Write a protein that binds this ligand. Structure first.
Ligand SMILES: O=c1[nH]cnc2c1ncn2[C@@H]1O[C@H](COP(=O)(O)O)[C@@H](O)[C@H]1O
Ligand SMILES: O=c1[nH]cnc2c1ncn2[C@@H]1O[C@H](COP(=O)(O)O)[C@@H](O)[C@H]1O
Ligand SMILES: O=c1[nH]cnc2c1ncn2[C@@H]1O[C@H](COP(=O)(O)O)[C@@H](O)[C@H]1O
Ligand SMILES: O=c1[nH]cnc2c1ncn2[C@@H]1O[C@H](COP(=O)(O)O)[C@@H](O)[C@H]1O
Ligand SMILES: [Mg+2]
Ligand SMILES: [Mg+2]
Ligand SMILES: [Mg+2]
Ligand SMILES: [Mg+2]
Ligand SMILES: [Mg+2]
Ligand SMILES: [Mg+2]
Ligand SMILES: [Mg+2]
Ligand SMILES: [Mg+2]
Lengths: 297, 297, 297, 297
């Protein structure tokens, strides 16, 4: 009578099966979407962590073809200033808005300052507001996502974090332009030890991807990626892109080597996986390849 | 032809799935029952171990809104004296009887001294007698539970330890006001190594909770809890409250830091779990949230 | 298309479920059978290993109520002499033949000396001949078992080692008075590493016990027992008794503390298990209690 | 909605079940095929690695009754010269062509030099060309296999590496005389860590063997074998022979003890497994014995 919904799988539970391939790793397309309205040339997002993303690293992420989410452990005036630095800043893949400015995102919470914070970020020219808490399937987050969409209809909004189909549907209904997936996997996050709560990330991604199929709402896989192999698996489970934190934290660009080298490795691995599965682009990678389930052995 | 009843799960086999939430962790209700007749403001009980509960720690447990079970590795006269110390002793959550005295429990076994021991404890004003052995699904325990209920009808009686539906039904039929669950999990208890006997505690709790549904008989989860996360899982599997031993053993109040700090952490974690699952009170937490099963990976 | 017969379980895969109990550990019966014709007061046999059983330890085993199998890494004349020492040697449980002599067994192989070896052992008064090789489901062993039964009908004969129902039936048909179970589990035996061959011992025991049900042919569980808990599980899976090697190897009685202390511990644990399962005797222990299957966690 | 094809098993997931046996290990036949046209007296192939197979070790492998595949991390002229050394070189089991010359194979890739490389190797008298890449289920490999078969019909050709039924069928259709199985298991190969790609080798072998049943196309198990036990399991899963790399790398014969000692051990273990399963020859070993699946425990 124990209420078990399903067996749920993490990265180490699965491997990608090779499939017939004609397109070499160097030739596949990595283009994807962050949100309904924002495209990325690589499926990489940097985390809204105070050890990872401020203006310097967000500029670098945008130049690489991804995007950075400025963390919110700072005052409103400073966070707006971080956004302005990016917006005012050869990188052929660079993520840019219609005015040719580098794209940037910024995190907000649900606390008392949120309305004022969102307004300041929008005024600073932020491309996307990320309503970002430990539990996105909540009145607080869902209300705030709807408020941002209704109040600032010209900005993109992301809600998270979630790990279920029901949560995905709730955020989509609130007007989210993308959802962020990950409850438990944050490299350690002591969510499992302290609250006993979590959903293994491969299942979490797949369940959200299935819920959002046909909606046009992207999903971002946030947490638990240690190697480029995990990144490839996240994509095949259905993620549109992956958010990384601690792997970027030691870099020259992160707050007190080069980020470019880590990005190159990560995308090298993803390209290798696409070659193995015969996936010519991200849409194929998300929808066609298969996994095998493996044992502890 | 190997006689396997089921696959049985322990704490590390499962995680709680987040659900829609509106009530913040700080605002949920932790009120529950220890027995048919005894309510607790927090779902915490201290173990009847000689390294854990004598009068000092039992007083502290009652003040925190839980209860202590005085251990029985002492003479009858001393155990009665321990009970009197608690009964004769701002704590707004304090567990108190109808006379405004702090509640306390006391353990007895099945040996020759039991009748005299029970009589002395009852005379000392004990709120609940815990008939407490390694194997509660036994003639000795079931007979003693019935005897206490028939002889001292105004005292509460707990029987344990058990790990099966059949055992739960047997104790309920004997007149138990609550049952205590745990064969194997006692942090090590060498029951598994020496006798090869045990039932993984999440399954044990769920099986007992199902057997007792609609009876009004609470069940206490005893053993194996290392982190607040385990406590949350125990509740969702169906426990009314949790008994802890070794985690309290190092405290200022335990027999030769403060117990309050550990209680605060444990309840903090439970509150976090209730927030994640959208459980506003313990009755909801016990009956509504779901688990995912996870692999070793 | 991989040819997998079943999932097979070892000791650590299972735990015994407690059942209603009235008979205390100190009061249960440990009496069992080694073979069709030989009874034992405890379900313990010492291994035919040159670090475990020569006359000294076999005498001690018989006195304890079990039996020793003299190893065969010695000349025929010495092995007969070892047997004579036991046969010619307060121990109320002692295993004795109809003449009041301590019982003893002796191992033989399938090599050229076997006929002469068996004849010498029988002449020396051996109670049971153990035809003992790494692979008992073989022409060599099955032929030798039939030969011993036809040539020396008044001696008991054991064949092994086996791990399948088919093998059990083959030895029973050859006239074996008991079969010995264990391919792989010998504490390390590098059978799994070198040949990739083995059957997890709990499944091996259960499969053999099912094959032999109603035949009157006992089965001996040989190998892999590290703790008294494993011994209890072996019995509930269907073993009539257990053979131990390395656990006895360090003892005062084994070839270059007391064996009695280890026997006392092992039987103490088995008694505890019988108490937990409510098994009053070995026949009940073999046939009534249930297991739960558990995870790595 | 996670796209999982199957649960897939590796060596440590399974054990061989003993079966009725009459043929001793020393008496079983180890004869098998490398390709449609090439027979081997033992089922052993050395890897095309620059730490494993050049002329010296390939000569030794052929003398032992197996074959070596000369690695391709060298110029065309040197690789042809390596082949000539073997072709121009008591060993009763020696692998020889119709002219009495030791057999040898050589690896090629898919790069620009392949046509010229293949021509030079064929002119040098190579017995088999191995079109050898990380992903054999690819346009590059399948095209090259067909080209070699159509251009040099008198040479044997192997394609690999693959891990699926579909891939096996594709190579067979291209004209491959054998396929090589292994994506992931190469002792570490960081294919799993970097690309997240792989198929546990026991399942990979069985799936390919099933696809090729009745075609006359052999399959070679390449990678992941640490012990002779793994070798036996690979055969029973359906491999015709096994390719080994790192285990040979430290030997006197490998590029900067004796290879013979390692071969003797490996075949000793395989012989032991055939004895346990009652397999008199390789065809029996491949098709008749069964596995049990085992747990982490
Ligand atoms: O201080 C924190 N608060 C909340 N979430 C965090 C914090 N640090 C890391 N995380 C989570 O963990 C993710 C990073 O995971 P990582 O790539 O494994 O380091 C973030 O994007 C967040 O979702
Ligand atoms: O000395 C003992 N005898 C019997 N049970 C014990 C003893 N010590 C601990 N336990 C059990 O283990 C539980 C404590 O588990 P813990 O919270 O993991 O330390 C107790 O409530 C008892 O059920
Ligand atoms: O040298 C040996 N040859 C064959 N079998 C052995 C040898 N040593 C131990 N065994 C096996 O392993 C069993 C002992 O297992 P143990 O109680 O785990 O030490 C023996 O009864 C034998 O079945
Ligand atoms: O440098 C390499 N490139 C490609 N494959 C390799 C390399 N080294 C080892 N392998 C693979 O790993 C196999 C050897 O596996 P091993 O017997 O476990 O050492 C080779 O036959 C190859 O399939
Ligand atoms: Mg900073
Ligand atoms: Mg700073
Ligand atoms: Mg004391
Ligand atoms: Mg004291
Ligand atoms: Mg000796
Ligand atoms: Mg000696
Ligand atoms: Mg070289
Ligand atoms: Mg060299």
């Amino acid at each position: 009578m124990l209420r078990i919904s399903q067996e749920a799988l993490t990265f180490d539970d699965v491997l990608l099966i090779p499939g017939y391939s004609e397109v070499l790793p160097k030739d596949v397309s990595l283009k994807t979407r962050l949100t309904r309205g924002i495209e990325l040339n690589i499926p990489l997002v940097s985390a809204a962590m105070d050890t990872v993303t401020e203006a310097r690293l967000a500029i670098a992420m945008a130049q690489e073809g991804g995007i950075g989410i400025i963390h919110k452990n700072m005052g409103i005036e400073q966070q707006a200033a971080e956004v302005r630095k990016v917006k005012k800043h050869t990188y052929p893949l660079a993520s840019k808005d219609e005015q040719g400015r580098l794209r940037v995102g910024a995190a907000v919470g649900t606390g008392a300052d949120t309305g004022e914070r969102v307004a300041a970020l929008v005024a600073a020219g932020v491309d996307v507001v990320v309503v970002d808490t430990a539990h996105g399937h909540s009145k607080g987050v869902i209300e705030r996502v709807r408020w941002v969409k209704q109040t600032f209809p010209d900005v993109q909004v992301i809600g998270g974090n979630i790990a279920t189909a029901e949560a995905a549907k709730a955020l989509a209904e609130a007007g989210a332009d993308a959802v962020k997936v990950g409850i438990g996997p944050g490299s350690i996050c002591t969510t499992r030890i302290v609250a006993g709560v979590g959903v293994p990330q491969i299942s979490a991604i797949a369940n959200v991807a299935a819920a959002l199929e046909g909606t046009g709402v992207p999903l971002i896989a946030d947490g638990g990626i240690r190697f480029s192999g995990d990144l490839a698996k996240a994509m095949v489970a259905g993620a549109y892109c992956v958010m990384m934190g601690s792997m970027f934290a030691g870099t020259e660009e992160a707050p007190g080597g080069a980020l470019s080298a880590i990005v190159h490795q990560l995308m090298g691995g993803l390209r290798a996986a696409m070659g193995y599965t015969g996936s010519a682009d991200i849409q194929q990678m998300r929808t066609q390849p298969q996994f095998v389930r493996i044992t502890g052995a």
